[PDB]
Amino acid sequence: LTKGEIVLFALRKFAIASNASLTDVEPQSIEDGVNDLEDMMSEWMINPGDIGYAFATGDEQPLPDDESGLPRKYKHAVGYQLLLRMLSDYSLEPTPQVLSNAQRSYDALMTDTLVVPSMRRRGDFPVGQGNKYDVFTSDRYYPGDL
Amino acid sequence: TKLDEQFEKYPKFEINKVATELNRIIAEYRNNRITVKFRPGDREASEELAN
Numbered sequence: 001l002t003k004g005e006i007v008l009f010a011l012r013k014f015a016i017a018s019n020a021s022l023t024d025v026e027p028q029s030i031e032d033g034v035n036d037l038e039d040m041m042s043e044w045m046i047n048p049g050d051i052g053y054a055f056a057t058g059d060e061q062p063l064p065d066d067e068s069g070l071p072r073k074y075k076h077a078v079g080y081q082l083l084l085r086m087l088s089d090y091s092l093e094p095t096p097q098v099l100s101n102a103q104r105s106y107d108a109l110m111t112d113t114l115v116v117p118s119m120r121r122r123g124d125f126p127v128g129q130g131n132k133y134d135v136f137t138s139d140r141y142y143p144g145d146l
Numbered sequence: 147t148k149l150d151e152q153f154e155k156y157p158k159f160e161i162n163k164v165a166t167e168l169n170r171i172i173a174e175y176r177n178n179r180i181t182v183k184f185r186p187g188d189r190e191a192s193e194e195l196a197n
Contacts, residue, residue: 124156
C-alpha cells in the first residue's frame with residue numbers, strides 16, 4: 001500500500017504503450033523520468049500547493065525505490081500530468097481521450113484543496129451597542145487584524 | 147494596515163450632529179432658572195416666617 005516512486009512511472013509508461021509487454025525502455029528512461037518527477041513536484045510547490053511529497057535529502061539520485069509520501073488518491077492525477085510532460089521525449093502526441101482523463105483527474109485533485117479564504121471586518125467598523133462592549137466583551141470596533 | 151511596509155491609518159472624519167438638540171435643552175434651562183420658594187401656611191404669623 002506504501003507507494004514507491006516507480007509505481008507512478010509504471011503508470012505513465014504503460015498508460016501510453018511503452019511498458020505493458022515490451023522492453024522497459026532501458027534503465028536510462030527511468031532515471032530521466034524520475035528527475036522529471038522531482039522537478040515537477042518542485043514546481044507544483046507553487047501553483048497547486050503542497051500535497052505531501054517527500055523530497056531527497058542533500059544527496060542526488062532520488063531513486064525509483066524511495067517512498068513518494070503521496071496518498072493513493074492522487075496517483076492518477078500525478079501520473080497523467082507527468083505523462084503529458086514526458087510525451088515529447090519520444091516524439092508522440094496525446095489523443096483527446098488522454099487529455100480528457102488528465103483534466104478529470106486534475107479537477108478531482110484541486111477539489112480536495114480549496115480554501116475560499118473569507119473576508120473579515122475592517123478594523124474601523126463599529127460594533128453595535130447590542131453586543132454590550134462594556135461588560136461582556138471589550139474593545140468596541142472590530143480588531144480586524146491578528 | 148501595513149500598505150507596503152508602512153502604517154498608513156484610516157481617515158477618521160468627525161461631523162458632530164448630536165449636540166444641537168442638547169444645546170437647545172441647556173439654553174431652555176439657562177433662560178428660566180427656577181429656585182426654592184417656601185410657601186406659607188394658614189396661621190397668624192406664617193407669612194412673615196416665609197418671607
